[PDB]
């Protein structure tokens, strides 16, 4: 349904790990930036749920990645603002479940994220802390 606590959710259940599948899901979600804070919350809860698998989390990671990236592209802070905070949870918790290979894909997401500063440095650090807490190891720079 429109603007329901389910529209974006059903998208997650029909994503594909490809440029256009993510692009179509992204451009749509981008049209309803009104839902940015809500979708960020539902997105995290959907990824943190025990009823989701690594692929659905990889799909969700790619969707939000394109969304927040393209959002900064046209300065739609509502997305990157909301998604950023919940990102540290998701990316950091799925980091504890993703095999080394999907985790590598996420590692790039976390890299390009802070390299381009799609979120605030605090959010960047919170994501890094979450990944770090998964193996209890750290670095002298952020």
């Amino acid at each position: 349904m429109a603007f329901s606590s389910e529209q974006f959710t059903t998208k997650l259940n029909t994503l594909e790990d490809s440029q256009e599948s993510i692009s179509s899901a992204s451009k749509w979600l981008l049209l309803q930036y009104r839902d940015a804070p809500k979708v960020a919350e539902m997105w995290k809860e959907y990824m943190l749920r025990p009823s989701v698998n690594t692929r659905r989390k990889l799909l969700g990671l790619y969707l939000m990645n394109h969304v927040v990236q393209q959002a900064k592209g046209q300065k739609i802070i509502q997305f990157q603002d909301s998604f950023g905070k919940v990102a540290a949870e998701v990316l950091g918790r799925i980091n504890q479940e993703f095999p080394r290979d999907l985790k590598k894909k996420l590692s790039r997401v976390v890299n390009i994220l802070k390299e381009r500063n799609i979120f605030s440095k605090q959010v960047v650090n919170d994501i890094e802390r979450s990944l770090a807490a998964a193996l209890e190891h750290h670095h002298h720079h952020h």
Binding site: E16, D17, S18, Q19, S21, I22, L61, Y62, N65, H66, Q69, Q70, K72, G73, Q74, K75, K105, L106, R108, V109, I112, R116, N117
Partner: peptide
Amino acid sequence: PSYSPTSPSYSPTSPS
């Protein structure tokens, strides 16, 4: 699958 966790999309930072 074919998506890039990098993407060519980006824009300079600005307060507005």
